[PDB]
RNA sequence: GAUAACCGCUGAAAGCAUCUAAGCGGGAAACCUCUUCCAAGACCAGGCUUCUCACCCUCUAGGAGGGAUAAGGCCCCCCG
RNA sequence: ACCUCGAUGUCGGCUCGUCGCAUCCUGGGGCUGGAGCAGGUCCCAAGGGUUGGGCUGUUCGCCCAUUAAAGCGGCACGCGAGCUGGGUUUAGAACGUCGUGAGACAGUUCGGUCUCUAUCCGCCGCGCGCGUCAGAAGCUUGAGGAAACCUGUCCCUAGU
């Protein structure tokens, strides 16, 4: 997990999505698995 | 001169609201009001002519919002590191009259008179209440339109 | 305000309609009638809610 | 259920193991009680068992204690106190009247025993608290005992509730947990419990299961 | 929306009762019960299919809509067919056997690995590496076959532990 | 028992996907219980019981004032 | 340069602590260029714990044995009406240096008075009074507080 303000898709993979109020980056890869905070 | 009470003036009456479904916030509002005596004329600041109120159903209150989880009562025992906290959902589930009960002091005066005030709210967490025999009024919580 | 909320008027809107029916009863004496004569400022209510506009919330 | 009686220290002795290792034990007069009375949820809201222990003349015995006593039907006694159980089954085990002895336990369970430690009068920060004090040399100014600083500065300008300082010590309710009952006497109604228990000699005790290796 | 607009078809072997918001459906492996969000609508086609509706599209209603209409058709799909999650065991020396109403497995640690099966759901083993999961509620279903997943860490190493039947896990390679 | 990070189940809005938007679960020496002690001056001053449950006088016939008692208690006394 | 110069005593040590988490250990996790052991990094977590010595007035730092670890900070760089007084920073004396000199030196050296019977708040303990709708006594409920909360090694599972 990646916890920082600024959260990037890094891949074509990653698609981004709102939990819990959280910014949060869901993929495949567990590489690019992060979070905002 | 302007009326004063005098000593036999003062004559009391027995309300009973019902907290189901209600928010707390207008319910001690109300309650607070009748408690004073604000909707007397013959109201005096230095004088308790306010009427008892009982409070049934106090644990089916209602709370809008995460207020359940997130809203906190706050107690300091005076140790140091003595302050302990519970959410008013937590505070529900153990002392369901002490939701309702904070609210309403909270809004009365924090005077003497106010603590002497205290003594005419009764607040219970069932349908139920001992005071049969003192033959309470239902008040249901109105607004006069303008 | 307490008497006027009993006769199901508020105070700010009972000022407003005795105003406009033009009775110059100053608010001594009105609380001295809210206490000592209900019957006499239950009247005053009368005459005040009926000088009242039809639309309060209108313009003008 | 928890099973307890009342008694009175006797005094602190030495046995041998079959293993032939030593144990100190504190005798303990697990005397003969009588159920007084029975507290139960529908009275008074929970569920315990009061106990009588030790002799009395009834001279003694004011009128309103010897009341309470003749309407349960026992003679008198010094010493009255609950033991407090979870549940009504375990009320239902004891009758007004009933006489328990120390045999209601076996040798190697495990008892807390609940006593009033000895008395300490006014005593001072090292022996109440178990503060270093000071150097007994090298200059230090008549501090060898004192308990030094108690506070910050002007920030909080006050002493906290709970600084520990000089005070009457002692005398206190104290339960000792988890000690082993060596031996039951039966014929001379007496525990042998392996370790220390508070109070002097000649106090009342009472032993109870515990309730952390019961 | 797109979702909720299609309607459910209801077998002649399946019998719903609707009851205001309360939802009853029965049929042969079963009843279930289910509960409508207040906003959404649900009606029933006499022909025999399932008509999920909403009062708005505000967003809301739009998202309950659809929703609903999945909740009732996998409720229908229970009683029908019941829900079977196929899962399969690998590496050496670990194992499953049913004991009764619970399974036991033996995934390389001291002790074995107990789980008592909840009420309405069962096992089945077919081999000592490979067995099932079964029951009427899709949601029960799914639980105890995710907490039967994570019975172990995941191993990309080895490719040790509990999968599903078709599970394609991430490896890697450990050259040291 | 309720949770943190975290792991999820069942799923739309958005025909796919998503731990979440409706709902349902795992999850730590922190938190609430649990263990020990204080505690009804807890002024909402609590509860279960037991004992004494009794008498004279004065003011005026209102409320008080005084004296003598019961259960019990204190002081003195022998002590810890 | 805003309070205090009709006075708010300093560094270090000692005693006693109390709070924050930006966590040193112990507890829970994600990702690893994580095979395993052992790590790297990030997230959550403040309940408890967090050694004794050599040198220096020292803080700091270096070192010697240990440890699960030898955390970082706030509180007048916490704490001198609680202690110390080695350093600094009065008066003596000396060296180097500067000055014609009297003298001077964030240069050095040896020596050099640490006052106070606690009124108020605060804190630790202990009584007296009155109250809790008659006067008393035994046993109690617990709203609400306080205390406690650390961790190792070895042996099995397994030389798996
Ligand atoms: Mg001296
Ligand atoms: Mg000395
Ligand atoms: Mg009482
Ligand atoms: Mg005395
Ligand atoms: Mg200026
Ligand atoms: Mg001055
Ligand atoms: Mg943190
Ligand atoms: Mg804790
Ligand atoms: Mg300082
Ligand atoms: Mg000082
Ligand atoms: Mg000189
Ligand atoms: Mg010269
Ligand atoms: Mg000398
Ligand atoms: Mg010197
Ligand atoms: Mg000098
Ligand atoms: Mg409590
Ligand atoms: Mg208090
Ligand atoms: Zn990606």
């Known amino acids: ?37 | 001169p302007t009326y004063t009470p005098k000593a036999g003036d003062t004559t009391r009456s027995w309300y009973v609201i019902d907290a189901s479904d209600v928010v707390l916030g207008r319910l001690a509002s109300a309650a607070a009001t009748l408690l004073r005596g604000k909707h007397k004329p013959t109201f005096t600041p230095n004088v308790d002519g306010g009427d008892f109120v009982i409070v049934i159903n106090a644990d089916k209150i209602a709370v809008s919002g995460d207020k359940l989880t997130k809203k906190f009562a706050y107690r300091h025992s005076g140790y140091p590191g003595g302050l302990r906290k519970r959410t008013i959902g937590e505070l529900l589930e153990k002392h369901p009259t002490r939701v309702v009960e904070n609210a309403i002091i909270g809004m009365l005066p924090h005077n003497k008179l106010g603590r002497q005030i205290q003594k005419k709210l009764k607040v219970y967490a069932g349908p139920d209440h001992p005071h049969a025999a003192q033959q309470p009024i239902p008040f249901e919580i109105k607004q006069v339109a303008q | 305000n307490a008497a006027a909320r009993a006769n199901d008027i508020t105070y700010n809107r009972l000022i407003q309609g005795l105003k406009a029916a033009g009775v110059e009863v100053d608010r001594k004496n009105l609380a001295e009638l809210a206490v000592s004569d209900p019957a006499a400022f239950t009247a005053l209510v009368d005459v005040a809610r009926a000088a009242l506009p039809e639309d309060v919330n209108a313009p003008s | 259920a928890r099973k307890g009686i009342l008694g009175t220290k006797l005094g602190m002795t030495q046995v041998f193991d079959e293993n032939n290792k030593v144990v100190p034990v504190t005798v303990v007069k697990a005397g003969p009680n009588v159920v007084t009375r029975i507290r139960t949820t529908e009275r008074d809201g929970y569920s315990a068992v009061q106990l009588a222990y030790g002799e009395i003349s009834p001279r003694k015995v004011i009128k309103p204690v010897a009341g309470q006593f003749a309407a349960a039907g026992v003679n008198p006694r010094r010493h009255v106190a609950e033991l407090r159980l979870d549940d009504e089954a375990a009320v239902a085990e004891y009758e007004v009247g009933q006489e328990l002895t120390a045999e209601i336990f076996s040798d190697g369970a495990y008892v807390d025993v609940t006593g009033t430690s000895k008395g300490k009068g006014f005593a001072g920060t090292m022996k109440r608290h178990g503060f270093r004090g000071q150097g007994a040399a090298h200059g230090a100014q008549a501090v060898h005992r004192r308990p030094g600083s108690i506070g910050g500065c002007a920030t909080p300008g006050r002493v906290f509730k709970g600084t520990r300082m000089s005070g009457r010590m002692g005398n206190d309710r104290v339960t000792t947990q988890n000690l082993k009952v060596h031996k039951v006497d039966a014929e001379n109604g007496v525990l042998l419990i392996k370790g220390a228990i508070p109070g002097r000699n000649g106090g009342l005790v009472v032993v109870r299961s515990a309730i952390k290796r019961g | ?176």
């Open chain 1, 1 to 37: 997990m990646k916890v920082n303000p600024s959260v990037k898709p890094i891949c074509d993979k990653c698609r981004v999505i709102r939990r819990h109020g959280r910014v949060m980056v869901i993929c495949s890869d567990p590489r690019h698995k992060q979070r905002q905070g």
């Open chain 5, 1 to 176: 929306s797109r979702i909720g607009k299609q309607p459910v078809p209801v077998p002649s072997g399946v019998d719903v009762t609707i009851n205001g918001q309360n939802l009853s459906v029965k049929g042969p492996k079963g009843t279930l019960t289910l509960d409508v969000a207040e906003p959404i609508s649900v009606s029933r086609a006499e022909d025999g299919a399932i008509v999920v509706t909403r009062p708005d599209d505000e967003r809301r209603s739009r998202s309950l809509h659809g929703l609903s209409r999945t909740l009732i058709a996998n409720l229908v799909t229970g009683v029908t067919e019941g829900y079977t999650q196929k899962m399969e065991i690998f590496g050496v020396g670990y194992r499953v056997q049913l004991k009764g109403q619970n399974l036991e497995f033996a995934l390389g640690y001291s002790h074995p690995v107990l789980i008592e099966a909840p009420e309405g759901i069962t096992f089945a083993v077919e081999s000592p590496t490979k067995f099932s999961v079964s029951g009427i509620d899709k949601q029960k279903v799914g639980q105890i076959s995710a907490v039967i997943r994570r019975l172990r860490r995941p191993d990309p190493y080895k490719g040790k532990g509990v999968r599903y039947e078709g599970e394609q896990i991430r490896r890697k390679v450990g050259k040291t």
